[PDB]
RNA sequence: GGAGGGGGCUGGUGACUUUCCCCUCUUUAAGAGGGGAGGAAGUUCCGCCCACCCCAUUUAUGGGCAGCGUCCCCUGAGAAGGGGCGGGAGAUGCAGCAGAAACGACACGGCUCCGGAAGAGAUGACGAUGAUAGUGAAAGUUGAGGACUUCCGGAGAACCGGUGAAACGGGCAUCUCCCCUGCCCGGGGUGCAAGCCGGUUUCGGCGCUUAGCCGAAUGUCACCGAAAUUACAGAAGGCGGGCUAUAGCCCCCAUUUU
RNA sequence: GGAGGGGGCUGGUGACUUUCCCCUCUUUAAGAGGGGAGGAAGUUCCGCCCACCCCAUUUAUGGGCAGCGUCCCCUGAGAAGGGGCGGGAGAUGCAGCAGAAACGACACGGCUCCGGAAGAGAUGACGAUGAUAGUGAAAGUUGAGGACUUCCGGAGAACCGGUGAAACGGGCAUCUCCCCUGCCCGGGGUGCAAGCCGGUUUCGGCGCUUAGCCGAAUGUCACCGAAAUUACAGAAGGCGGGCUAUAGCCCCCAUUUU
């Protein structure tokens, strides 16, 4: 509600959920996505919208903008963990190696159009 | 005979000629306008201020007129022309036209356009 | 009351434009310039007796006054073993401040107790 | 928003300011944004980059709003940025 | 060079323009003013070659209830002018600091024109004293002397405390109009040729400021164009 | 109420008190001697010179009298006392006794010997 | 401090001594003077405390035949004084260079007091102009103004050419006597406080020189004793 | 004989002359006879023998006659000894 | 005429006291002082057009102007061989002037002719 | 008449005539008396009063006063020459040696009393 | 060179008039000579001399002042201006809201022990909002076929509290005493409009003056000089210190500028 | 250091007012800018440009100016001020009185010769107021038993004239020509109130202005400076020279004085 900077369409929102499920080479947790963005291996950072409290992921949009890493939002926290491969919901997921989803992650990079 | 040598221009008085006009409906005589000025100098200047200014009227035919005063005290006698309010049934209001150092510039700046030189032609003829 | 509320509408922007000007100047490298803006923002808050926004609250070290850019001059971590809290530490001076979420942790404990009793 | 009525309560920091009249001949014609503000001295950085010390009481400033331009004397602009927000009323007369 | 008089016809207004005057003031000495006098006064100004600024007048009412009333009446006219011999009316007029000039402190009180403490409140409130010439026109010998010694006491307070001075003929008929030069010569008579010249400028400097305030959108000495 | 604060001594007027006496056979009233002085100032000083001098009469019981004038213009008003010649059936001739800065020295130098202080004792009693 | 007046009784002479005066002049305005007026005038001088110098007067006769006549009459009295409005009498009076003072150039001619060439012949002949105060006492408003502008013209010629000036009340009765201080104040009114003081000295410096000449055997400013 | 009336025509050479008043302070008090005479300068030799230069116009001389003493100014004594005998008339006034 | 004769009575003493003052100063040795007195005496004679006395006539050399003291600066002799005359010569300058008495010599010739004719 | 400075009494006038006749050692002439006074041998110089012209003996009183030689006058020119020893009158006689008249010439020196 | 700040100096001479005032002297009544407002006189925050009353006649006790320059803090173009002078003990205050808790420490929540309830033995409970887990447990490195727990109540050694200007601990401000070092001893109260005297309500004199007025004097002009009657301002018993407003020129500093 | 004399300089800037004047420009009628009396403008002793008439058209003749600085003379406290510029010839003047004679020389008296009268031969005449007597005979040395003369008249070589400012001889002053040296060539007469033009007595314009008025303007205040609006004085076509009156400061000189 506060840390979200842009409104994400629903048709591209499933494409974030498709890219994480296709690759399955990901880091889960709020600490592991922070280590991935400062090293620069992370190509896309997925942040849930329904977090509470918001302070655990509030530094994720401000760190992704300064490092130059593209990022977008997903409305559900539980559907992010199910696509990641866990029964428990994860707040955020960053991708290291896309594999088959390298063709998809360029299409997620149209979020820069949503930024301006 | 009564004949006095004119003072040298270093010792002679410095004078200015006040062109004025009384604008009204009724008429005024030459003996009236010399009296109302002299009554105005004794009220404003006083007896001491009269000798400092030396007021004198030379000529009055039209509502226009030419009045004599000192060069240093044109400012005080011009306020004497405006403070006189009435003459016994009828108001007074003197409007000045300008001042000059001679009759020759005062007669052509505001009064008229031409130059008559009448003092020279009546002295040698009569 | 009407002149007090209209001044508060003015001063709510005066803490907002002065803080956003501090954010874009802090990434330029001039940390002394960004410290000057928030010092004017910390001074103008106590004259009107108005509060800081909740977004710009945790961005400033309370000791020195430098703007914290996450990663540049700020080391933020999530420590959740003993008690769940996030810690901001200034790389310039060295002060340490923490934000516990124990009152928000207590709700999901109480929400899971109601889900076990209903099921 | 920025209005000419509330420009005496507005923060000058972050506004393009140019000077049209001044007693000192060097201060006339400079354009830039205000960075810092004291009681009777404005700090304006140019587009060239030169920091110039401008007193308020001796000159008149032309503020750049969102499109609009406002001409207000610096004699109305006496005071620190702290106490100018609360209540500062000045009266000027051109005599 | 600014004159304050009461307009009756065209011929006296045509006469004052021919001699020295540049612009003058319509002096409505009544509580009944409207646009009917204002549409005629523009016809006299555009008749030969002139500019007229119209002003209103109030007289002998209470202290603070007159202040709330005349502030509504001043929004329709250009300038205002307050007269009064009572000192509690003279003191209450300067605190409102929206009046431009004040007249007649010598004919209502007949004791003294301006006090010492009255000049100090006129400093930060910027209220000028207006001098009148209609008074000396219809007095007697000692009565002309009494208002003149009152005027000399008003000049020294306005010179030391820098209070602006504006002269007026305060004329009523066709012939009470005077020229500015004898009025300059009468003020040159009293104190100084330097102080007599600055009086004519404060006559001029008032009507530019009052006009330019209500000409365009100017609020608290700040104009907004474009 | 009519109450005016007295001017500071830097801004207040500088005054001298003229002691004089009218020596004759006939009698004069207080209203007569204030009128003949005021008629004398308008003839000598004028209307402009009256405000420069500020003439004032305070008290007249005897043929003696005390008159007020400015400090710089004692010389011009003393000539005003001597030029008045007659009052409607009978001459006038004012002889001055001296001038001083206060009532206290003027009342004891030429007028009398003792000091009465009457202005203080009638203000608080009445 | 020297006064010129006409003695009638003792009381007015006793009054002028009580105020300011030191010594004064008996002014015999007739062609009939003798020792009978001279034996009375010493009794008034020794009455309270006084010194009197008696002088005679001649008026409206011819130019040069009056000069041979009054030179015989001056040997019996102290001083002489000539009056006249005719310019040929005024010019003839200064060439004889034995007269001390001259009066009335404004009431007989009614045109101008002293000419420019008349002041230059008074330089090497050392004849003083005497100013009168009896004239302004019984004039009208404009008539007081005319003699005063004549007196201002007489002061500038006596200041530039250094002609001595002596004032006189020229009194006739008991009450036309004035004090010297208002007479000093009237001359301080006209031109200067410096020139007003020197006039009183030339009033004094005449009567010492005329007395010391006929006191002892003094001929052509040379005294012989022992 | 020597008379005070003809003392302006008399020859000063051979007469004891002393000065009572003078503007210069040294010339007051000297006594002696006159030896030489010019237009405006008297030459007096003292009893001491010192020749002293005395101008006439600035001082007054006291002449010694046959017994008598006469006080006459030197302002009456202007002129050379030649033309003073023929006709010289001077008029003085103490003002 | 009366003022002319009274001035001549004055000026007869002025050539007499100035010459007698020259005589007693000439024996003192100051010949320049005695020359000054008679030069004033020779000058005052021609303004009035009056003559010198007969006693003081032959005492002065007409060339230079020095007073002649007989024997001191004057060499006087009686030469009576050819024509009877006395000669004064100044020892200072050297001029020569003579006084013949031929008109007085002619009388004693004429007196002795009348004595011879009567006897 | 002119060169005579003092009036001589008649009783002493014969004593000048007695002194010249008793001595008879004298110089006669106007030139010889001038040579005698400048040398200083002359003790008394006798000058006649009735000379004409007076210039021949006019220098005799002025030369006798400066040299300090006593002198007096005699009224007759003819009686001076008869006492001197000549029939022709002599204008002046000066004495060199008195002889028997040395007692007389001191009495002629009372002419200094006649001088003052 | 231009707006500004701080410090210092602010009269002398000559003439007129005792009718500008005071004092003195002589003298045929008037003349002569000398002196005449400031650095603040304003402000009344002070003290003393001077007066009067009360207690006391004491440096035994005790009282009063000072710790300066220097240094510390705050504000301006950073020259300059303003305030304060060490330490110990006790009491009160830091509202409101927020925070576990607001001035001495504590209770309370994470840690340990005991009791009760629920689920469960290749299952189920929990866990990437952090799991068995360690360190002087603020902080920081760690990060999962990890894995036996979760809640409530009571008692306790050690460590740490999302707020706010400021906290398991040290500050700030005020008041009162005891610790210091130096100097001086009558201690308080009022005050010249005090107080005293002829007088006996009221008035005159004294207290009062190298200006000394009181119905409140100290004036005018010229000039050297350049410190000058211009700005602010005018004595009322005197002197000393502090604050306040500024003219003219000299000296010092800053910014703009070159 | 003090009375005095001579020489030099005498305005600039800012403000007010076109109602102090002129000129220029623009402009809803009034504003802005610039300039505005001197070393004498006074005195009229001058000249020229400029104008008009007469003769002449000439450096052939002739006219005009200059001989400066320097020097000479006169007067004052001797610095300073005033006047004049060589020579030759001719004419007049130096009165009055005095002197032989007063401006070229002379006559006259002392010297010589002749004539007449008076006195006289160891006498008489004369002579110390000068005798026979000399010198280039002004002057000076001489000075007596020295000693033959004295007077009048006429004629002549040499030398000298008691006076007076000044003389058997040289001066002074004025006027006119011929002798000089240098330079320049229309020569006189009047004059801006000249002269010209519309006009045709009278008036307006031109001649007229880096002030240009004419019934005659050029003003007031402040200040640096110290040369300042103070003294004397005020334009009338301009310029140059001479005389006259003086303020302020600078420079030079004198006397008193030390
Ligand atoms: Zn920090
Ligand atoms: Zn000789």
Coordinates of N, CA and C in Angstrom, one line a residue, chain F residues 6-80:
Chain F
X6 N 3.6 68.8 27.2 CA 4.5 69.8 26.9 C 5.7 69.3 26.1
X7 N 6.2 70.1 25.2 CA 7.3 69.8 24.3 C 8.6 69.7 25.2
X8 N 9.5 68.8 24.8 CA 10.8 68.8 25.5 C 11.6 70.1 25.3
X9 N 12.5 70.4 26.3 CA 13.2 71.7 26.2 C 14.2 71.8 25.0
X10 N 14.5 70.7 24.3 CA 15.2 70.9 23.1 C 14.2 71.3 22.0
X11 N 13.0 70.9 22.1 CA 12.0 71.3 21.0 C 11.1 72.4 21.4
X12 N 11.1 72.8 22.7 CA 10.2 73.9 23.2 C 10.7 75.2 22.7
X13 N 9.8 76.2 22.7 CA 10.1 77.5 22.3 C 11.0 78.3 23.3
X14 N 11.9 79.2 22.7 CA 12.7 80.0 23.6 C 12.0 81.4 23.7
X15 N 11.8 81.8 25.0 CA 10.9 82.9 25.3 C 11.7 83.9 26.2
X16 N 11.2 85.2 26.1 CA 11.7 86.2 27.0 C 10.4 87.0 27.4
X17 N 10.5 87.5 28.7 CA 9.4 88.2 29.3 C 9.6 89.7 29.4
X18 N 8.9 90.5 28.6 CA 9.1 91.9 28.5 C 8.4 92.7 29.6
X19 N 9.1 93.3 30.5 CA 8.5 94.2 31.5 C 8.4 95.6 30.9
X20 N 7.2 96.2 31.0 CA 7.0 97.5 30.4 C 6.1 98.2 31.4
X21 N 5.8 99.5 31.0 CA 4.9 100.3 31.8 C 4.3 101.4 30.9
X22 N 3.0 101.6 31.0 CA 2.3 102.7 30.3 C 2.1 103.8 31.3
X23 N 2.8 105.0 31.1 CA 2.8 106.1 32.0 C 1.9 107.2 31.5
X24 N 0.7 107.3 32.1 CA -0.2 108.4 31.7 C -1.2 108.7 32.8
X25 N -2.1 109.6 32.5 CA -3.1 110.0 33.4 C -4.4 109.1 33.4
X26 N -4.8 108.8 32.2 CA -6.0 108.0 32.0 C -5.7 106.5 32.4
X27 N -6.8 105.8 32.5 CA -6.7 104.4 32.9 C -6.9 103.4 31.7
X28 N -6.3 102.3 31.8 CA -6.4 101.2 30.8 C -6.9 99.9 31.4
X29 N -7.7 99.2 30.7 CA -8.2 97.9 31.1 C -7.3 96.8 30.6
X30 N -7.5 95.6 31.1 CA -6.8 94.4 30.6 C -7.2 94.1 29.1
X31 N -8.5 94.3 28.8 CA -8.9 94.0 27.4 C -8.5 95.1 26.5
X32 N -8.1 96.3 27.0 CA -7.6 97.3 26.1 C -6.2 97.1 25.7
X33 N -5.3 96.7 26.7 CA -3.9 96.6 26.5 C -3.6 95.3 25.7
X34 N -4.5 94.4 25.7 CA -4.2 93.2 24.8 C -4.6 93.5 23.4
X35 N -5.5 94.5 23.2 CA -6.0 94.8 21.9 C -5.0 95.8 21.2
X36 N -4.4 96.7 21.9 CA -3.5 97.7 21.3 C -2.2 97.1 21.0
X37 N -1.8 96.0 21.7 CA -0.6 95.3 21.4 C -0.8 94.5 20.1
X38 N -2.0 93.8 20.0 CA -2.3 93.0 18.9 C -2.5 93.8 17.6
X39 N -3.0 95.0 17.7 CA -3.1 95.9 16.6 C -1.7 96.5 16.2
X40 N -0.7 96.5 17.1 CA 0.6 97.0 16.8 C 1.4 95.9 16.2
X41 N 1.2 94.6 16.4 CA 2.0 93.5 15.8 C 1.5 93.3 14.4
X42 N 0.3 93.6 14.0 CA -0.2 93.4 12.7 C 0.3 94.5 11.7
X43 N 0.6 95.6 12.3 CA 1.1 96.7 11.5 C 2.6 96.7 11.3
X44 N 3.4 96.2 12.3 CA 4.8 96.2 12.2 C 5.3 94.9 11.7
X45 N 5.0 93.8 12.4 CA 5.5 92.5 12.0 C 4.7 92.0 10.7
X46 N 3.4 92.3 10.6 CA 2.6 91.6 9.6 C 2.0 90.3 10.1
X47 N 1.3 89.7 9.2 CA 0.8 88.4 9.5 C 1.8 87.3 9.6
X48 N 2.9 87.4 8.8 CA 4.0 86.5 8.8 C 4.9 86.7 10.0
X49 N 5.1 87.9 10.4 CA 6.0 88.2 11.5 C 5.4 87.9 12.9
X50 N 4.1 87.8 12.9 CA 3.4 87.5 14.2 C 3.7 86.1 14.7
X51 N 3.7 85.1 13.8 CA 3.9 83.7 14.2 C 5.4 83.5 14.5
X52 N 6.3 84.4 13.9 CA 7.7 84.3 14.3 C 8.0 84.8 15.7
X53 N 7.1 85.8 16.1 CA 7.4 86.4 17.4 C 6.6 85.7 18.5
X54 N 5.3 85.3 18.2 CA 4.3 84.8 19.1 C 4.1 85.7 20.3
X55 N 3.4 86.9 20.1 CA 3.2 87.8 21.2 C 2.1 87.3 22.1
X56 N 2.2 87.6 23.4 CA 1.3 87.2 24.4 C 1.4 88.0 25.6
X57 N 0.2 88.4 26.2 CA 0.1 89.2 27.4 C -0.3 88.3 28.5
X58 N 0.3 88.3 29.7 CA 0.0 87.4 30.8 C -0.9 88.1 31.8
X59 N -0.5 89.3 32.2 CA -1.0 89.9 33.4 C -0.8 91.4 33.4
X60 N -1.8 92.2 33.9 CA -1.9 93.6 33.8 C -2.8 94.1 34.9
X61 N -2.2 94.6 36.0 CA -3.0 95.2 37.1 C -2.6 96.7 37.3
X62 N -1.3 97.0 37.3 CA -0.8 98.3 37.5 C -0.6 98.9 36.1
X63 N -0.1 100.2 36.0 CA 0.4 100.6 34.7 C 1.5 99.8 34.2
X64 N 2.2 99.0 35.0 CA 3.2 98.0 34.6 C 2.6 96.9 33.9
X65 N 3.4 96.1 33.2 CA 2.9 94.9 32.5 C 4.0 94.0 32.1
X66 N 3.6 92.7 31.9 CA 4.6 91.7 31.5 C 4.1 91.1 30.1
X67 N 5.0 91.1 29.1 CA 4.6 90.6 27.8 C 5.6 89.5 27.3
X68 N 5.0 88.6 26.6 CA 5.8 87.5 26.1 C 6.2 87.6 24.6
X69 N 7.5 87.3 24.3 CA 7.9 87.2 22.9 C 9.0 86.2 22.8
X70 N 9.5 86.0 21.6 CA 10.6 85.0 21.4 C 11.9 85.5 21.8
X71 N 12.9 84.6 22.0 CA 14.2 85.0 22.4 C 15.0 85.7 21.3
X72 N 14.8 85.2 20.1 CA 15.6 85.8 19.0 C 15.0 87.1 18.4
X73 N 13.8 87.4 18.7 CA 13.1 88.6 18.2 C 12.6 89.5 19.3
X74 N 13.4 89.8 20.3 CA 13.1 90.8 21.3 C 13.3 92.2 20.7
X75 N 14.2 92.3 19.7 CA 14.6 93.6 19.1 C 13.5 94.1 18.2
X76 N 12.8 93.3 17.5 CA 11.8 93.7 16.5 C 10.5 94.1 17.2
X77 N 10.2 93.4 18.3 CA 8.9 93.6 19.0 C 9.0 94.8 19.9
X78 N 10.2 95.2 20.3 CA 10.4 96.4 21.1 C 10.2 97.6 20.3
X79 N 10.5 97.5 19.0 CA 10.2 98.7 18.1 C 8.7 98.7 17.8
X80 N 8.0 97.6 18.0 CA 6.5 97.6 17.8 C 5.8 98.3 19.0

